Write a protein that binds this ligand. Structure first.
Ligand SMILES: O=C(c1cc(=O)[nH]c(=O)[nH]1)N1CCN(c2ccc(Br)c(Cl)c2)CC1
Ligand SMILES: O=C(c1cc(=O)[nH]c(=O)[nH]1)N1CCN(c2ccc(Br)c(Cl)c2)CC1
Lengths: 306, 306
C-alpha cells in the first residue's frame, strides 16, 4: 500500500538524449534511429528571438553549423530539415539503444513522465499532467529545452512532449514530437499568456478512490447525486464537467471499492462546498488532480513493464 | 523555474534488477558484479514466517534451490551466503551493466529515489525521505521486496535501501545493502510498530527557501528569532530541533535569497502558531518536509549527472 507521485523508469529514454549546439546556443536533442529531434529555436540568436523567420534562418545554415554530441562521441550531421516547430537532424550513425517507440499527442488531463536534461545529460525524472489550458506545471531551468515527456506502454515508449519554453507565469509550454505546439503558443520570445486553468474532475475522483483503497474513508457519505446535479456544482468551482465516458473509465475503481461513481461524486460535492476542515486525504490538504484513473490502477493494483 | 518531487534517473539501476525465486516465493534481486543481493526472507515458507531460524533454513538449501532470472537469461547460482538480513547469491556471470557503485547508510531526514520492481522488472520511480522513526512512506504492493533505494553522486550510484516489509500502519521498513535494518525492526511476520514520527525541520526550511526562489513570499515577515526561542516552539509542534549545523547547511539558500536562516525561522514560527489561513506554498496547503537543502539547490540552481 501507499501512494506516491510515481514516474516511469527512465532508462530507455536516457540512452536517447544528446546535446545539440548551433553557434553559441546549446540544448537537448532526442536521438532515435539516425534522426536527432530538437526545438527549432536552437537556430535563433538574440536578434531573431522577438520575430524569427525560421525559413530564412534555416536556409542560411549548413550541416557543419550543427554540433551533436552523444556523451563524448560526436555525431556527424549529414542532413537537416524542419517539421513544424521541431528540427530534424539526420546523422551518420543510428542510435543502437533506440527503443521501440511511437509519437503520440496526448489530451488535457493525461499524465506523463518528464526526463529533465541539461547539456544532453539526464538530471531528474518527474510526473506531471497536461493542464486543461495546454500548459504543464514543470520544473525546468535554463538549458532544459528539448527535454522530453513520455509514457511507457508495455515495452514501447510513447513520446508525447518536447519542452520549448517557460511562460511568464512560471508554467511551461512545448510541442508534440511532430512539432505541433500544445496550446495557442508560438516559439518566439513575445509576451504570451495561458488561458485560465480548471481542475481535472475525473482525476480528483480517481484520487479519492486511491484514498479509499489506502484506508482514508472519512469523506464518504451515504448520499448520491446525478451527473447533472454534480456538474452544476462543479461548474461553480472551476471544475471540468463530468461525462458518462468518465464514469465508465472509473468503473474498475468503483468495482474494487464497491463505491459507485455517483456516490463518490456526492462526497466530492460536499468537499467542494464545506472544505476539508483541517483533515487530509493521502497526506494532502488539497484535492489532487494530477493522477489519472489508469495511474491509480497501476499503483493500487500493479502493472510492471519489460 | 517550478518545483517538483524529482527522482534520480533510474537507468543505471534498471540494468541491475533480477528476479529471485526460492521454492514458491519470488522477489527482486540486485545484481552487481557476480553477486545477487536480496532479502533473506525469500527462504521462508508459511510455517517459518512467524519465528524463522535463518541459519537452519539456509543450511537446508543448495545452490540449485535458487532460481535467478535476468529478463530471459538464467543465471547459475554457484554459491550462497548470508550477511545480516541480506542473502548474497554468487552467480557464474558478472553483470556487464554494473555501474560504479557504493553502499551507504543514510540518516533520518535524507532523501533517496526508490525503483519499485515486480518480478525483476522496474515499474516506477519515486522520491522519498527516511523518516525520523526509520520508516519510509513508500508505495509498494505484493511482490516488491528487494526493490532498492539509491542516490546518484556524479557518475556513482549510492545504494542505501533494500525493501523488506510493510508495517501494519502502511509504512515501509528495510535494510541498508549490508543487511542492517533501518530502525528497531526484524524480518519476521510479527506485530511491530514504528515509533512516533516527527517533522524534519531543516527540510521544511529548505522548502520555504524554494518557495521564495519561485516567487511565493506571502509568509515572510521582518522579525527574527534565536535558535533556542525557535526550538522551544518547534518542540511543542513535534518538530525536530534545529542545530547550528542545520543553519550552515542552509547557507547557500540564505545567500541566494538574501534571507537569513533565523529570519526564515521566525516565518516558520508564525506558520506553526497561526496556520496558512487557506493560502498555499508551492501548491501545497501543508508544510512539506521531504526535500533536503541539497534537493532544493539541485532543482533551483541546477546539477546534472553523467
Ligand atoms: O532554457 C531555457 C529555459 C526553459 C525553461 O523552462 N525555463 C528557464 O528558465 N529557461 N530557455 C528559455 C527559452 N529560450 C528560448 C530561446 C529562443 C526562443 Br525563439 C524561445 Cl521561444 C525560447 C531558450 C532558453
Ligand atoms: O511483497 C510483500 C509486500 C511488501 C509491501 O510493502 N507491501 C505489501 O503489500 N506486500 N510481502 C509482504 C512481506 N513478505 C514477508 C515475507 C516473509 C517475512 Br519473514 C517477512 Cl518479514 C515479510 C513478503 C511479501
Amino acid at each position: 500500500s501507499g501512494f506516491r507521485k510515481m514516474a516511469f523508469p527512465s532508462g530507455k529514454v536516457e540512452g536517447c538524449m544528446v546535446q545539440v549546439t548551433c553557434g553559441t546556443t546549446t540544448l537537448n536533442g532526442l536521438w532515435l534511429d539516425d534522426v536527432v529531434y530538437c526545438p527549432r529555436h536552437v537556430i535563433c540568436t538574440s536578434e531573431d528571438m522577438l520575430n524569427p523567420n525560421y525559413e530564412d534562418l534555416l536556409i542560411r545554415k549548413s550541416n557543419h553549423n550543427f554540433l551533436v554530441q552523444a556523451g563524448n562521441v560526436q555525431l556527424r550531421v549529414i542532413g537537416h530539415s524542419m517539421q513544424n516547430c521541431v528540427l530534424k537532424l539526420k546523422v551518420d550513425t543510428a542510435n543502437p539503444k533506440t527503443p521501440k517507440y511511437k509519437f503520440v499527442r496526448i489530451q488535457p488531463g493525461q499524465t506523463f513522465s518528464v526526463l529533465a536534461c541539461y547539456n544532453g545529460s539526464p538530471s531528474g525524472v518527474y510526473q506531471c499532467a497536461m493542464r486543461p489550458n495546454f500548459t504543464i506545471k514543470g520544473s525546468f531551468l535554463n538549458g532544459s529545452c528539448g527535454s522530453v515527456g513520455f509514457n511507457i506502454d508495455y515495452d514501447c515508449v510513447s513520446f508525447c512532449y518536447m519542452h520549448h519554453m517557460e511562460l511568464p507565469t512560471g508554467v511551461h509550454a512545448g510541442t508534440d514530437l511532430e512539432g505541433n505546439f500544445y496550446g495557442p503558443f508560438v516559439d518566439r520570445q513575445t509576451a504570451q499568456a495561458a488561458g485560465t486553468d480548471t481542475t481535472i474532475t475525473v482525476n480528483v475522483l480517481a484520487w479519492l478512490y486511491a484514498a479509499v483503497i489506502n484506508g482514508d474513508r472519512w469523506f464518504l457519505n451515504r448520499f448520491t447525486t446525478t451527473l447533472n446535479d454534480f456538474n452544476l456544482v462543479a461548474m461553480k468551482y472551476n471544475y471540468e464537467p463530468l461525462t458518462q465516458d468518465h464514469v465508465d473509465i472509473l468503473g474498475p475503481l468503483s468495482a474494487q471499492t464497491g463505491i459507485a461513481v455517483l456516490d463518490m461524486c456526492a462526497s466530492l460535492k460536499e468537499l467542494l462546498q464545506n472544505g476539508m476542515n483541517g483533515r487530509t486525504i493521502l497526506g494532502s490538504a488539497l484535492l489532487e488532480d494530477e493522477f489519472t484513473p489508469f495511474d491509480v490502477v497501476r499503483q493500487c493494483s500493479g502493472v510492471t513493464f519489460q
